[PDB]
Design an enzyme around this catalytic site. Sequence first.
Site, PDB file in Angstrom:
ATOM      1  N   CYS A  60       0.844  -1.190   0.000  1.00  0.00           N
ATOM      2  CA  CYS A  60       0.000   0.000   0.000  1.00  0.00           C
ATOM      3  C   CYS A  60       0.867   1.221   0.000  1.00  0.00           C
ATOM      4  CB  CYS A  60      -0.884   0.095   1.216  1.00  0.00           C
ATOM      5  SG  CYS A  60      -2.197  -1.131   1.300  1.00  0.00           S
ATOM      6  N   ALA A  61       0.586   2.097  -0.961  1.00  0.00           N
ATOM      7  CA  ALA A  61       1.296   3.370  -1.094  1.00  0.00           C
ATOM      8  C   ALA A  61       1.329   4.177   0.210  1.00  0.00           C
ATOM      9  CB  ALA A  61       0.654   4.181  -2.188  1.00  0.00           C
TER      10      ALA A  61
END
Lengths: 167, 167
Positions: A60-61
């Site tokens: 996840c960014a």
Amino acid sequence: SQTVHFQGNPVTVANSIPQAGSKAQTFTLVAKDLSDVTLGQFAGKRKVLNIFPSIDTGVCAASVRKFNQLATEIDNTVVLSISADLPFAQSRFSGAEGLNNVITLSTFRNAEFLQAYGVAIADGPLKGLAARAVVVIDENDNVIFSQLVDEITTEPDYEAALAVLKA
Amino acid sequence: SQTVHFQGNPVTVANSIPQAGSKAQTFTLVAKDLSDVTLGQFAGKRKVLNIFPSIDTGVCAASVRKFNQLATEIDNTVVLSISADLPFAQSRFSGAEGLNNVITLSTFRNAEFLQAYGVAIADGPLKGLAARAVVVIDENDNVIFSQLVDEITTEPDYEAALAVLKA
Ligand SMILES: [Cl-]
Ligand SMILES: [Cl-]
Ligand SMILES: [Cl-]
Ligand SMILES: [Cl-]
Ligand SMILES: [Cl-]
């Protein structure tokens, strides 16, 4: 040889992730503009290597951003976000939220890095990719923290990794 | 070896691209789901290899689609879209709507393929990537057409390729 896990299966990882106290080996990896970058050009700084199977898979960014900000807030520190993704894919991940001192590097033509740092996945479908791992290297090029994450899709112990940089 | 151009600078490409009238060599490459796939999988078909330095840079998804569409509309045809991009990047480029008979295939753990097929960029910034190339293979594994594109960032002679396919 090491064993981590992915999709309920054992994954062989080559050699051994360096344990704290180990001399960090030299490497060359590739930057976003395709120029070659060495460990030696970060002389004097502490380095946090955030190593991923891919920046397009499982990550996840917003998680990675938050760690990156905590890390680069610590004095005299650079984050090297390393994966076998080509440089072009690592740049999509990093879009326009590149903070200071977060440097993307690709192993696509420097596979020997993964062997040397004991993160080369040797079998299963992720074969040829880097295992999930965090290696912290001090200002003298000695490893002061490392984690080979046992479950590949989970998050490294970022807290223990940064705690070491306070001392 | 061969010479192509990138930013008007010569680029060295290893070995030689398969010539017309030669037998295509066996290879293994990686599909979008990390399974290996072989040239044998496509026995009985004509195969168009559409070979890119990257799918993530200097390529127009919309123009590649039009060609894929025309090629796959020719009877008994599969397009194999090949690069050193990881399958994860190739699956982004591809979308949920990449047609049937267009298989993305990555060379990231099969560097030998780029050498065998005379498309391994051996120097300069693109070292480690595939040159821009098209190879057409007939239903009996004979290379019937091939182009090593002299200027890396320009389109292949698709028309010529479709013609040889329809003929
Ligand atoms: Cl170095
Ligand atoms: Cl762990
Ligand atoms: Cl993570
Ligand atoms: Cl084969
Ligand atoms: Cl040409």
